[PDB]
Amino acid sequence: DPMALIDQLKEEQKLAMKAKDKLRLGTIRLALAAIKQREVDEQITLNDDDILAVLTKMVKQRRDSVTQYEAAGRQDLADVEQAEITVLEEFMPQPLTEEEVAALIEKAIAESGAAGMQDMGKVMGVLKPQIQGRADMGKVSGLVRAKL
Ligand SMILES: [Zn+2]
Ligand SMILES: [Zn+2]
Ligand SMILES: [Zn+2]
């Protein structure tokens, strides 16, 4: 039952403001503005996975700015962008460990009653939402194929 990402971002905004941590505050504010943009423009309420997509795009855009700054010799500016990325990445999940993936697979097999390679789709359909972008699906496939 982790705190919703929207609430983690708002709490971190309040703390960064009280800390007078200027760069951190500014980047959190931009994440919250990107969330508001989607909720107004798409007429939806974002969940955690939606917010993770918001953060992933912000990290991508800043990573492309790092590329441009570093190609121009402006490491000082690329470092500011890296500091922004580090703030954003605080809210992102860690990749699943090998042992974590193996456990998800064994749980997916137990609950789906999977037996044999014909049940590859049955298992992967259970796993795919649970794995998100936290593991290589091809490797997960191969681990599942082994057990089946
Ligand atoms: Zn923090
Ligand atoms: Zn920046
Ligand atoms: Zn977290």
Method for structure elucidation: X-ray
For residue 67, the CA-to-ligand 2 centroid distance in Å is: 12
The dotted CATH code for 98-147 is 1.10.10.410
For residue 51, the CA-to-ligand 2 centroid distance in Å is: 19
Q: Which ligand is nearest to the CA of 27?
A: 2
Distance CA 3, CA 9 (A): 10
| Placement of tokens 């505050």 in the chain | 25
Which residue type is seen at 100? Answer: E
Q: For residue 1, what are the CA distances in angstroms to 5, 40, 114, 146, 148? A: 11, 27, 29, 32, 32
Which helix (H) or strand (E) element contains residue 5? helix 5-19
In the chain, where the domains are located:
5-89, 98-147
Distance CA 12, CA 9 (A): 5
CATH of 5-89, one of 1.10.730.10, 1.10.1510.10, 1.25.40.340, 3.20.20.70: 1.10.1510.10
Q: For residue 37, what are the CA distances in angstroms to 9, 41, 55, 100? A: 15, 6, 13, 35
Which residues place a Cβ less than 5 A from the ion ligand 2? 81, 84
Q: Do domains 5-89 and 98-147 have the same CATH topology?
A: no
Q: What is the resolution of this structure in A?
A: 1.7
For residue 60, the CA-to-ligand 1 centroid distance in Å is: 21
For residue 12, the CA-to-ligand 1 centroid distance in Å is: 6
